[PDB]
């Protein structure tokens, strides 16, 4: 019973930290993708 | 075999010169839009 309960708890902890990890990757992904988009726009006017 | 057997032992004259085929459809290809940057927008799973 205790084995089952502790596996549940560690899985719960992993699940709890995973969301915030995803959010952080999302945040820094937006940060870089901004500069990606503007650099694309520079290359666009160069094509023009 | 056949006696119909068209006998004309001479060089012929060009009648219809070879031209570029007058088709308006399919010497081209199919257009395709793709970009990993439209997989950009993500949700924030917040409830649970």
Residue B10: Cβ within 10 Å count: 5
The answer to whether A36 and B37 have CB atoms below 8 angstroms apart is yes
> Token pair of A16, please?
């709890």
Burial string for A20-44 (b: 16+ CB within 10 Å, else e) reads eeeeeeeeeeeeeeeeeeeeeeeee
Q: Angle at CA A15, nearest 5°, toward A10 and A17? A: 100
- Which of A19, A23, A33 is opposite residue B37, by nearest beta carbon? A33
Does residue B24 come out as left (phi exceeding 0), alpha (psi in the -120 to 50 range) or beta?
alpha
Q: Is residue B42 within 8 Å of residue A26, measured between CB atoms?
A: yes
C-alpha distances in angstroms, A32 versus A20, A27, A28, A39?
Answer: 19, 9, 6, 11
A-B Cβ pairs (cutoff 8 Å, strict)? 8
């Amino acid at each position: 019973n205790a084995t089952l309960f502790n596996k549940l708890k560690e899985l719960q902890q992993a699940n709890a930290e995973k969301s915030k990890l995803n959010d952080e990757l999302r945040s820094k992904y937006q940060i870089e993708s901004s500069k990606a988009a503007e650099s694309a726009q520079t290359l666009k006017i160069l094509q023009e | 075999e056949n006696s119909l057997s068209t006998t004309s032992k001479s060089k012929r004259q060009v009648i219809v010169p070879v031209c570029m085929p007058k088709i308006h459809y399919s010497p081209l290809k199919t257009g395709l839009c793709y970009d990993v940057r439209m997989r950009y927008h993500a949700k924030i799973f917040t409830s649970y």
